Amino acid sequence: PDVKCVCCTEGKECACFGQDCCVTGECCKDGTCCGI
Ligand SMILES: [Cd+2]
Numbered sequence: 814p815d816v817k818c819v820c821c822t823e824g825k826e827c828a829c830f831g832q833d834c835c836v837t838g839e840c841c842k843d844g845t846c847c848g849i
């Protein structure tokens with residue numbers, strides 16, 4: 814309950830879950846998230 818990656822901050826399916834890119838949200842500040 815304290816992140817920028819709505820992906821995890823929401824409870825959706827993440828592929829980079831439990832990471833730092835989730836905090837910084839760098840995986841949610843370019844175009845989209847997830848995409849193995
Ligand atoms: Cd995430």
Ligand SMILES: [Cd+2]
Nearest residue numbers: 820827846847
């Ligand atoms: Cd994701």
Ligand SMILES: [Cd+2]
Nearest residue numbers: 829834835840
């Ligand atoms: Cd991430």
Ligand SMILES: [Cd+2]
Nearest residue numbers: 818840841846
């Ligand atoms: Cd993300």
